Design a protein around this nucleic acid. Structure first.
Ligand SMILES: [Zn+2]
Ligand SMILES: [Zn+2]
Lengths: 40, 209, 97, 302, 240, 179, 172, 59, 116
DNA sequence: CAGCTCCCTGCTGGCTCCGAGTGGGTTCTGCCGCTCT
RNA sequence: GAGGGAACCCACU
DNA sequence: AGAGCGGGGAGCCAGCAGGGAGCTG
């Protein structure tokens, strides 16, 4: 008796993300989780 | 365009000749299946110049059962038709002692013209017909069944058989398109033959009111 | 009759609504009289023809002998007489029924 | 198609309505235009009404005191090829609307000239359309030119019939609107032919056109059929429409009940609606009419 | 009487085991629904890239809605058909449907597989809010669940948005009944009063109260409607 | 049918409030009155309506709406039944304090997390012996009364399971959640 | 449906309507309470104490780079051009009230009290409130223009944001 | 039993397994006997406690 | 395109077009007072029929903050290159013919709006 | 030939209809003050 | 062995 | 002197005001 239930925002990450781009975009999705960057 | 009005005039003529053949007037088979190229041969092609002239398109037919009884079919050249031109046609009716006539207007007539046709209808029978109404034969439509104008003897034996008065029949208006097509007045009875899905055939009788 | 039918029904719909169910009546006659369908029958085709003619005279809707009455009676039972002739054929009553 | 059906169409049928909710035509095509899609489209664009608004992209009032020296100068060349009022209608059209209607530019010019008597003047060329209208030969000319601009936009017929708003071409996959013919073998064979279903009715004008079947072309408008084809034709049409309404569900009502209703509705030569305005105008007794409706008015008129 | 006493022997029931389908059927129905929702998203992204073709006679939103509704109705019919073919011969829903006693096949579809699309005035669930059907949705959401497609059966139970859209769908039917009774009654009354005195007379003609001829024979054949039957003309269809 | 209706269980109809303290707060929170502005400033400023009365314009509607919601969520100047709608597309802020508005309490979701946490449930578990009640939840900024016009500008989560990140993320900006 | 808050008095409804096409263009008129004919809206703005046209159109059209709003207020301006003074506008309104006046002074008093206490009571029922009432009337005309241009969408009658519930309190 | 409308913790399969844990058929059916003859009814009858209410509309 | 209104400077009112045949030019002549003004543009009345291709001036950038508007990451901004955007449709009656997405950059102070 | 007459059309106002059949209930008539002793 | 009307509301099929 | 009398929708039809034609002095 399981109920099927899901939604989808229709449309129309296909992007060559290198090391610095991946690092900055991971930080751009988890900004608030930084305690102390060290010496950056 | 000259070609559009040439096609119009040919179709109007063909419908008029079908109408006259249906009313019982003597119409030869050559004129009944007369085609557009035969209209371009018999008449002109450029009505703006006037090679087919509407006055040249006037039809004279005679009744099958009485060759001294004839019908005119006039085609006025003006869009709106008043007293002057129908009095010209009435003088023509008098001077060639014709009884019935059809006037095929192309836009209409004045109200006083319609009143005047009703006025001399006891003496001379004139019938208004628009060009747009005559651009097809309505009796060939699939909805329109077979209309047959009954002779007064047939009406007499009809009301004798069914023991009916005239007012106990179904009615049809005098301004009905098929009643106008067959040119029938009050007191005439139309036999209407139509196919039936339960009986096969059914004959209704309709008095012209 | 077939030309009349094709005039009446230009769409080719053979379904009509008619009083007597002739096919079921024929099946009733087969079951009542124990008709063996694999034997020769003692029914002369002229009996079929004349019986259908007399029956069609006997099914009167419009009464009288006036030609107006005759035409109305012919029109009132046109489909049923067509269907009765198409069903009680001498051919169909011999090889089919 | 938004064809009215069910109870509202039944009410539209038995109350003879001068304006049905969705009046429609079923145009059948006579000849190879029934088979070819492209001359079927030619008949479609010959039937559907096309105002000048249906093709215009923009219109503008300009000031050109000298037409030799055009202000706009995007159209200077052919205007000076041509060589009045200093006021100007410059109308630019949408080319897709200009092309799918198969209109040509001189047709628009001659329709302007015929509609307004050619007292004004229209000059055109393009190869980004331009049509330039000036008025030839007490009050400012702006209000007159704006009024004739509004008349050309919302009152003008380029092609088609005015009461018909739009036309639905389709090919029937069902025999209910097909062309059932009898072949040389005596078989019944369906012919899949292009049919048109308009959103307005002008039955006389449509029936009169070329390559339109003047036999099977019909309407769902009962008053239009009565005015065009007669009383027995509208009896047959009323029977067909009532049968459609009843048998859309697959439900069956015997033919004699529909036949009795239509024979009652068309017995007296005209369309007698199933209302007080049809039944209480009959030749029946005053007590029956006062039983139905408008009791006191019927009794006073008696 | 005979069948009621044999049913005393045999017995007939309906249970919660009749709403149950096989697990393979549930996987097939969920696969059909997932495929249909993927097709709906494909149509939405085609219309959003201006790749959808506007059919003649319809505006672009009308043909978009028609394509979506055709996909969802095909989904409901296919899921229902799989569910009602998976039924065993011992099923009670199947017994009462194929006996014709009670229940459509759509009832089996809605009980077992998919309740289906909910409609208000024939269209899908309107944007009652500012371009949303409910405040649980993003704006401009034209998908199945946003505009009233219920992907659950009555056995699975509806989600709250599906429950509210189904309440809108049923309220539409209750309204349609309670406002069509008066119009139908007025139509019936006017039909009666226009022909209450029309009758077959003793000369077999059909006349009204004032003896005008309506039909010369009743139904043009003079026959009563009770004793006529559906028959076939054997000489119309065949070739020469 | 469809004319006589019933309230839902947690639906509460607003009883009415004085527009005044909202009006002094708006006066001392950078709203420029209509009687002291040129019309040329209207074209890019957000109009402010209080009980349908256009009272002024404001040029920072983020901070004004956030300040007003913060005041309502802590039972300050804005009482709990005051409805505060922001129509972003048409640059309007409508404040309704009149009676007859029907509203319901919804949980507040901020940054995809409920503001209702386990300490509230623990305190409500002993309602008889903490004197903790529903009104303290209203005072804690946890639940919020949302009416019909304000429900056009909120993004509801049906369950807190909607707030969880999905493989096909439908929305990540839920504003409230259903109880 | 205007009604001044925290005061039980019956609601006074003002309509601001825009005529159908089938003159030059689209005319905005105002069905005021207790004025039994359709006053043009520019005449109402004149009667509120606004002789000019940047005054009226700044009250109505808030952005002057927008041309379509101007092209739709143009017929309403040009139909009400012959009235240019405040008291002339007051006479033009009061001549078609429920109680006409043989004296011009009585008609001026009638139109003043109608536009003072009956036309939009919620924004102001007191003197010197012509600017707030005129901004709200301009907002009504602005919303009419936005909906007629299609830029804004028509309101829904069944939306309970548009509906209040008279309970035992307001009814009693 | 809890029958709050939207509750994932309660579904037909869970209730069926719970009913099978008490020596009943999982889908609620039982082997009923005819009261008049004593013979087993061939179908198995869905029987269980259901909340009925008596309405004011007495004959 | 569209040409704006012209306003009188003396009596603060509307101007009206008129054609002076003395210079055979176009002047904006007020008819409450005697103020006249020559016209920079000859266009007096102008209408748009199928020229509704620009829905972007009706869009204000503020709609980037709407929590109910859908956000996407697959359509980056051209001006500032932000990943987040909000997408919606044009909701006018004159945009029932189209379901074109209009996008607004979610990031503050950018405000760039585009289509496709 | 200008002004008058005389019938088609467009408009607004008026008018009349709105399913069948059942239970049960409350609340109202009637609304109060007088002129005579 | 038979002494109120009307208005309204709710409900039933 | 208290007792009693008085005082909403939908759709069709009909009349009147506008045309456009014809008519006469
Ligand atoms: Zn000036
Ligand atoms: Zn950006």
């Amino acid at each position: 008796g399981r109920r099927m239930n899901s939604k989808m925002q229709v449309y129309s990450l296909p992007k060559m993300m290198t090391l610095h781009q991946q690092c900055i975009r991971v930080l751009k999705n988890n900004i608030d989780s930084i305690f102390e960057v060290g010496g950056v | 365009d000259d070609e559009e009005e040439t096609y119009r005039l040919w179709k109007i003529r063909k419908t008029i000749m079908q109408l006259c053949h249906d009313r019982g007037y003597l119409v030869t088979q050559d004129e009944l299946d007369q085609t557009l190229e035969e209209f371009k041969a018999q008449f002109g092609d450029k009505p703006s110049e006037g090679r087919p002239r509407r006055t040249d398109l006037t039809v004279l037919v005679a009744h099958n059962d009485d060759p001294t009884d004839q019908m005119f079919v006039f085609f006025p050249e003006e869009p709106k038709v008043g007293i002057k031109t129908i009095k010209v046609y009435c003088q023509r009716m008098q001077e060639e002692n014709i009884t019935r006539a059809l006037i095929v207007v192309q836009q209409g007539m004045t109200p006083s013209a319609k009143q005047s046709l009703v006025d001399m209808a006891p003496k001379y029978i004139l019938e208004q017909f628009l060009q747009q109404e005559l651009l097809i034969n309505i009796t060939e439509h699939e909805l329109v069944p077979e209309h047959v104008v009954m002779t007064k003897e047939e009406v007499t034996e009809l009301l004798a058989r069914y023991k009916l008065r005239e007012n106990q029949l179904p009615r049809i208006q005098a301004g009905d398109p098929v009643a106008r097509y067959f040119g029938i007045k009050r007191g005439q009875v139309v036999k209407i033959i139509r196919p039936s899905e339960t009986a096969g055939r059914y004959i209704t009788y309709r008095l012209v009111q | 009759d077939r030309e009349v039918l094709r005039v009446i029904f230009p769409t080719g719909d053979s379904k009509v609504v008619l009083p007597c169910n002739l096919l079921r009546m024929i099946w009733n006659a087969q079951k009542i009289f124990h008709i063996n369908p694999r034997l020769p029958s003692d029914l002369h085709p002229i009996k079929v023809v004349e019986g259908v003619k007399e029956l069609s005279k006997k099914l009167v809707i419009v009464n009288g002998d006036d030609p107006l009455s005759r035409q109305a009676q012919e029109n009132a039972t046109l489909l049923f007489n067509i269907h009765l002739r198409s069903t009680l054929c001498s051919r169909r009553m011999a090889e089919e029924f | 198609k938004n064809v009215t059906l069910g109870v509202p169409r039944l009410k539209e049928l038995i109350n003879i309505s001068k304006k049905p909710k969705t009046p429609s035509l079923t145009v059948f095509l006579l000849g190879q235009s029934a088979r070819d899609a492209e001359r079927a489209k030619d008949i479609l664009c010959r039937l559907e009404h096309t105002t000048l608004r249906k093709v215009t992209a923009n219109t503008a009032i300009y000031y050109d005191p000298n037409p030799q020296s055009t202000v706009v100068a995007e159209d200077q060349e052919w205007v000076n090829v041509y060589y009045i009022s200093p006021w100007l209608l410059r109308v630019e059209l949408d080319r897709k609307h200009m092309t799918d209607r198969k209109l040509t530019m001189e047709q628009i010019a001659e329709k302007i000239n015929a509609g307004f008597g050619d007292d004004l003047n229209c000059i055109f060329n393009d190869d980004k359309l331009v049509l330039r209208i000036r008025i030839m030969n007490k009050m400012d000319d702006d209000v007159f030119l704006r009024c004739i601009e509004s008349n050309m936009l919302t009152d003008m017929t380029l092609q088609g019939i005015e009461q018909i708003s739009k036309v639905y071409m389709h090919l029937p996959q069902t025999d209910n609107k097909k062309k059932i013919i009898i072949t040389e073998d005596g078989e019944f064979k369906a012919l899949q032919e292009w049919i048109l279903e308009t959103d307005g009715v002008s039955l006389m004008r449509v029936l009169s056109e070329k390559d339109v079947d003047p036999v099977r072309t019909t309407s769902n408008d009962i008053v239009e059929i009565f005015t065009v084809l007669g009383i027995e034709a509208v009896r047959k049409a009323l029977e067909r429409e009532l049968y459609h309404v009843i048998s859309f569900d697959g439900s069956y009502v015997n033919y004699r009940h529909l036949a009795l209703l239509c024979d009652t509705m068309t017995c007296r030569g005209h369309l007698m609606a199933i209302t007080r305005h049809g039944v209480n105008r009959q030749d029946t007794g005053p007590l029956m009419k006062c039983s139905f409706e408008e009791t006191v008015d019927v009794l006073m008129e008696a | 009487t005979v069948i009621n006493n044999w049913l005393l022997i045999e017995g007939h029931t309906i249970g919660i085991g009749d709403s149950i389908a096989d697990s393979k059927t549930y996987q097939d129905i969920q696969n059909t629904i997932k495929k249909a929702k993927q097709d709906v998203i494909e149509v939405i992204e085609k219309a959003h890239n201006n790749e959808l073709e506007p059919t003649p006679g319809n505006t672009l939103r009308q043909t978009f809605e028609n394509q979506v509704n055709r996909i969802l109705n095909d989904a409901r019919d296919k899921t229902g058909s799989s569910a009602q073919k998976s039924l065993s011969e011992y099923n009670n829903f199947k017994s009462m449907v194929v006996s014709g006693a009670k229940g459509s096949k759509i009832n089996i579809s809605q009980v077992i597989a998919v309740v289906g699309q909910q409609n208000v005035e024939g269209k899908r669930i309107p944007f009652g809010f500012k371009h949303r059907t409910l405040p649980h949705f993003i704006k401009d959401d034209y998908g199945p669940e946003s505009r009233g497609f219920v992907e659950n059966s009555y056995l699975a139970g509806l989600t709250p948005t599906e429950f509210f859209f189904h309440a809108m769908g049923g309220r539409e039917g209750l309204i349609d009944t309670a406002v069509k009774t008066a119009e139908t009654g007025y139509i019936q009354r006017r039909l009666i009063k226009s022909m209450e005195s029309v009758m077959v007379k003793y000369d077999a003609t059909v006349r009204n109260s004032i003896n005008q001829v309506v039909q010369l024979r009743y139904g043009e054949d003079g026959l009563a409607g009770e004793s006529v039957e559906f028959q076939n003309l054997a000489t119309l269809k065949p070739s020469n | 049918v469809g004319l006589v209706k019933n309230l839902a269980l947690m639906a509460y109809i607003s009883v009415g409030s004085q527009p005044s303290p909202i009006l002094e707060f708006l006066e001392e929170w950078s709203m420029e009155n209509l009687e002291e502005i040129s019309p040329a400033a209207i074209a890019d400023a957000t109009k402010i309506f209080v009980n349908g009365c256009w009272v002024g314009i404001h040029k920072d509607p983020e901070q004004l709406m956030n300040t007003l919601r913060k005041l309502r969520r802590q039972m300050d100047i804005i009482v709990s039944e005051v409805s505060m709608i922001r129509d972003i597309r048409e640059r309007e802020i409508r404040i309704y304090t009149d009676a007859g508005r029907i509203c319901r309490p919804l949980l507040i979701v901020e940054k995809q997390k409920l503001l209702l946490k386990k300490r509230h449930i623990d305190q409500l578990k002993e309602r008889e012996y903490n004197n903790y009640s529903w009104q303290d939840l209203v005072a804690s900024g946890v639940v919020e009364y949302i009416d019909t016009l304000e429900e056009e500008t909120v993004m509801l989560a049906m369950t807190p399971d909607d707030l969880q990140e999905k493989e096909v993320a439908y929305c990540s900006t839920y504003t409230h959640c259903e109880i | 449906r205007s009604c001044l808050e925290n005061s039980s008095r019956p609601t006074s409804t003002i309509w601001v309507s825009m005529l159908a096409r089938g003159a030059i263009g689209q005319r905005i008129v105002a069905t005021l309470p207790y004025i039994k004919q359709e006053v043009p809206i520019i005449i109402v703005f004149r009667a509120l104490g606004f002789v000019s046209d940047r005054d009226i159109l700044e009250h109505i059209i808030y952005d002057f780079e927008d041309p379509e709003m101007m092209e739709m207020v143009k017929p309403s301006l040009d139909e009400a051009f012959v009235i240019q003074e405040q008291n002339v506008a007051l006479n033009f309104i009061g001549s078609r009230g429920a109680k006409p006046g043989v004296t011009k002074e009585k008609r001026i008093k009638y139109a003043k009290e109608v536009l003072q206490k009956e036309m939009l009571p919620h924004v102001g029922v007191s003197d010197f409130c012509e600017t707030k009432k005129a901004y709200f009337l301009g907002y009504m005309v602005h919303r009419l223009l936005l909906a007629a241009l299609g830029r804004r969408e028509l309101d829904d009658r069944d939306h309970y944001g548009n509906k209040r519930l008279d309970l035992a309190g307001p009814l009693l | 039993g809890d029958a709050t409308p939207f509750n994932d913790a309660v579904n037909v399969q869970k209730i069926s397994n719970l009913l099978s844990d008490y020596g009943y058929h999982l889908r609620g059916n039982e082997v009923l006997y005819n009261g008049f003859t004593g013979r087993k009814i061939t179908s198995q009858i869905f029987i269980g406690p259901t909340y009925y209410q008596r309405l004011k509309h007495m004959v | 395109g569209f040409v704006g209104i012209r306003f009188c400077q003396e009596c603060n009112n509307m101007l009206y077009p008129k054609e002076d045949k003395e210079n055979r030019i176009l002047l904006y002549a007020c008819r409450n007072c005697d103020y006249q003004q020559e016209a920079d543009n000859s266009c007096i009345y102008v209408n748009k029929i199928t020229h509704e291709v620009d829905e972007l001036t009706q869009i204000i950038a503020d709609v980037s903050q709407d929590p109910t508007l859908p956000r996407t990451e697959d359509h980056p901004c051209q001006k500032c290159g932000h990943k987040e955007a909000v997408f919606f449709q044009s909701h006018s009656a004159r945009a029932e013919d189209a379901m074109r997405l209009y996008y607004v950059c979610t990031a503050p102070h950018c405000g760039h709006r585009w289509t496709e």
